[PDB]
Design a protein around this nucleic acid. Sequence first.
RNA 1: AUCUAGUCCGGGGCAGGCUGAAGGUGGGGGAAACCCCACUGGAGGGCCGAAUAGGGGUUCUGACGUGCAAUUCGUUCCCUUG
RNA 2: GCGUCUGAGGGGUAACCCAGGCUAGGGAACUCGGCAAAUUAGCCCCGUAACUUCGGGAGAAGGGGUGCCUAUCGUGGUUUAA
RNA 3: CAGCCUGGGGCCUCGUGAACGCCCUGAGCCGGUGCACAGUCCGGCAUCUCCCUACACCGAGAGAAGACCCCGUGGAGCUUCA
RNA 4: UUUGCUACAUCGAUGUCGGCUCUUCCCACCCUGGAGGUGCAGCUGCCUCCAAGGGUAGGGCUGCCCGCCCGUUAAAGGGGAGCGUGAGCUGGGUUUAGACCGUCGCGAGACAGGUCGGACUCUAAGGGUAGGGAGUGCGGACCGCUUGAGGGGAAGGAACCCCUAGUACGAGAGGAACAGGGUUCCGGGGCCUCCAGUUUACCGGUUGUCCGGUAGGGCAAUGCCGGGCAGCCGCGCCCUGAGGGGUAACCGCUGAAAGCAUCUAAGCGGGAACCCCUCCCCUAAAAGAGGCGGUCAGGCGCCGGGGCCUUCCCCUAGAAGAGGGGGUUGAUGGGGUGGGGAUGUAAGCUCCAAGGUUGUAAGACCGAGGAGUUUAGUCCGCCACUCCCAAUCAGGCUCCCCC
Lengths: 54, 134, 339
Amino acid sequence: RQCSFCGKDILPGTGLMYVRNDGSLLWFCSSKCRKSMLKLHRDPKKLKWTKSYL
Amino acid sequence: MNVLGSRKGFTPALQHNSSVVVADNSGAKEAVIIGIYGYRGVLRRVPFANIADLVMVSVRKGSPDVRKQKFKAVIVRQRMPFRRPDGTWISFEDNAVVIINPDGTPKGTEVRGPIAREAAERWPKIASVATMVI
Amino acid sequence: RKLSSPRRGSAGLRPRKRADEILPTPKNWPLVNLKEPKLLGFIGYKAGMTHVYMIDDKPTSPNYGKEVYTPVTIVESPPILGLALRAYHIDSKGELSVLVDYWANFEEGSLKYLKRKITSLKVDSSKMKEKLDLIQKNLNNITYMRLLVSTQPWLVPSLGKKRPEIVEIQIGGGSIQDQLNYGLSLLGKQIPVRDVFREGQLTDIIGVTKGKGFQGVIKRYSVVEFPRWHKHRKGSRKIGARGPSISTPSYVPQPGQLGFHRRTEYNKRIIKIGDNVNEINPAGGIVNYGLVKNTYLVIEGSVLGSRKRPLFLRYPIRPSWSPESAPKITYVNLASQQG
RNA sequence: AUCUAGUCCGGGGCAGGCUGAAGGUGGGGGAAACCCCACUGGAGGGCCGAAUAGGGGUUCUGACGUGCAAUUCGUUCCCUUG
RNA sequence: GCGUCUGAGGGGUAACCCAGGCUAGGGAACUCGGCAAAUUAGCCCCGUAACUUCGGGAGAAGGGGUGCCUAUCGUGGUUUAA
RNA sequence: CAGCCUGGGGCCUCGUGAACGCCCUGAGCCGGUGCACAGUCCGGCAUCUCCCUACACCGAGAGAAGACCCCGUGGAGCUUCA
RNA sequence: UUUGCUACAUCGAUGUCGGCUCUUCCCACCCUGGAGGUGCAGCUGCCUCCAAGGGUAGGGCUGCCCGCCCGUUAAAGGGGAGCGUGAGCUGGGUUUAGACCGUCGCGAGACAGGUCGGACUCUAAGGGUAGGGAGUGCGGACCGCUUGAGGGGAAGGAACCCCUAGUACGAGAGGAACAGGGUUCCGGGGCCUCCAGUUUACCGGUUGUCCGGUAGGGCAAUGCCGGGCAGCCGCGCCCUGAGGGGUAACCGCUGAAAGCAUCUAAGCGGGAACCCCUCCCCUAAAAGAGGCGGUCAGGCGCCGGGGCCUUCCCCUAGAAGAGGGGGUUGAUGGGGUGGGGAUGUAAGCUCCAAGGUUGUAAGACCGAGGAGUUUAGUCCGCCACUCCCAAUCAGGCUCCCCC
């Protein structure tokens, strides 16, 4: 089970499902990831502490 | 109506005079929480509500024939972080309700957006026209 | 017009003062309940806590037979070293004072750990013979039979201390004559928690809660902030009136110490008694505690008290349900408490 | 009548901006009556705005309230070529 | 020019008071009263109702752009200088 | 429906250094009595002493010959068809 | 409880309505418990009695009280305590000085008719209260552990649902309860595993600024903004039965008075959110002032040492005090090494760079920035190992009762 943003391993019993109208699923390792989409809109690629760097 | 003896209720979500959208085809679009059925409170504690509760609101934006009218509904969408029994945490991007007839069936005939699983058991009539369930 | 309101603060525990011995003691004991000689509690330490995954064992659980998530507290269980046997009887005036003690570590126990805190007996008069048979002479006229045991924190580097506590536990079982012999064996040796406990039991907790210092009435008794305008006017964090008159300026919320109290806990059911430290140790060293390196007690819910406090345990006083053993698990969180 | 009230006489001040009446000029529409546009023009008990530029003291019944002081302090307002 | 708006040192700094900052979710249910506090805010361009004393209302309303750098270009002033 | 943090107070320490309540030092509480609500009186209940901090519930706390009502063959002021 | 009169007390002041918070009481019981009657098929009713343990909301209009109403809930009981409470508060009503309006007056003005503004003082001598500390006695000094008279409690209370059962019951419509489970709510006690918030520990970006440019920095009520450890709390999570005894009302039985009859007179049994015991909390200042373990040596008042405290190092703890530790026989705090974390990839170097500067060209030069050099660099009130450094020097108080 992978974070929608940091994609890293999600050790069980955490995270939060932010279900949109589309029924899509959003997974966050911590608050850092949740802010990264719902308010930051910053590029996951643009940074290099997520495996989606390049 | 049928499952509230189980874990009916979760972390605090809403309050009186809280505004929610109408997620159906009834004709109503915007509604404000006007009251809470069933619950009994204490000094200064505003009455509560979350998913799967007999809730009472009124029409603020919608068809004129329903404007400024009283109807019953159930809560289907909330923004609150909360813990499911299997230890997952669910949220909805906004807060929505579906108007229900006094007998219990929904007044509307269409459903907008996802619904947490819990409402379906408490209101199988909602589950009858439910499209997707999360 | 004077609407209904529950009296705020908790009048039940007055007076609220700080304990005088870091390790408390029970003042009653649950009945033996038709069984054989064994102890009815245990000592330990508050190491930390985490959350665990299990199948529900409650036959009447709404969650029966499923994996649900629950916070769980860890209790390192160092071995216990007994000290002596204490004699309680209906003495003169019909009371239950100590008849006599029965100490023996000259036969075994060349351990100065006890010496760190008590300048205990020398070999000069280790003549407990006339003491011990006094119990035998006073047999059949005895009511209660406790036990002198000490902790061995030196086997736990987490708590940097070397003078230990010696404390008590009352033993129930079969016949009285049996019980004394049962205790007699336990002297001079070491006793694991498995010698008293098994998984799936209930257990009771008496201990000292997390101290907090002098507190405010807002926090002490959860008194209410005055509405709006007082957030701007004359003061906010206090009660308005303090009684109808000097006719008992009463039990009303007033400031004072909160925390570090002798308190209570009911209905606590154990989860696991493991022995592999690697099964429970979280990432990077458990927070503020260290690295558990003895047998540990896996207890769910919350346990009162600050980290690094001795804790004394006990059989259920008013158990809600009779538990079976082994609520088997499915996951243990080794993730860092940090992060 | 060194305070305050008023008057008179002689003196000293109002950082910067804005708005754009009259009039002037040139286009343009039709012989006309005259109208539209552009700029120029710089009138007004007009407007915004410098804690201490200067004035008053508006709310906070905000702190002090056996004072910083026998009437303030900080906030928070309205006026500023008459 | 000052460390003189003239008392200082210790401390994991309790409550609390006065100055503040920030609070999920709901958003006036507090409340006599939205008091307080918040939100907007500079600038350019576009765009601007009812009514009226035709002068305004009017920053009515509302919308859009605004950084940094590599270049440029236009306009005007100025130096004995159409 | 409350919560966390920061500055100055508030905590402590060196130095300086007041005023208010004082028939008293003898005042714990509860019923009672009495000017009809006591610290001393009556009857019980208790009640070891010393120290520090927080609280203002009481001490019918302190602040001020009540700003109200009336009296005095008491003033001042105002008015008129006294 | 108001409201009428009384003027006994208060005129060198007992500061006046409401409301807010907070405590307690009472029962003429609103609900919750028990029992009964009923023009009680069952539900819903209606009524009587006992019962004050607990609970008894949230809104709109009105300043209130009152009153009208909204939607739930078990209902949304009523009263007291100087119409409880201003050295705790709001000033909305109302008691001044400025005005307007209506009635009256030739006039000064009056109104109990309405409307706008109008100052809310105090560092607690004493007690109460809530904690925290010293000493004497209980008894020579101590160290340790315990007995467990009274004290307080609501430490729980309430509702809804599952099945009972679509059963009982009623022709039907309709529609029960016992036990047993569970859930929720409110309240009480804890706790931070995860989440939310917090994070002037820290990291980065970035405006304005100056310190010669970069860099690294000063500042700008943390310069602004983004992030977030620990710790703390909550909007998060955990625990929060029942029984024994005596009883109220009452329901029974054996039973005479008074042959029968009679629950009552003695006699006997049950019978409640009622009172007590089991639960927790503080207790040897409990005056009967407890008990138990051990040491206080040894030697000739003396030697001597033994105990304790401060000093020393820290934190489980905190206003100091206390409490808990450690003290070379040591992992208590720093260092160092690893461990696990937060930010988000240091400088310099190289390459590219929208174009431009040159330079004949070749080439080298400026450039906001992108990439590698690099999950970097900085930092971490967290953990382990490691005696490298630091717990020493010193001072005080005191026992030799017992042989």
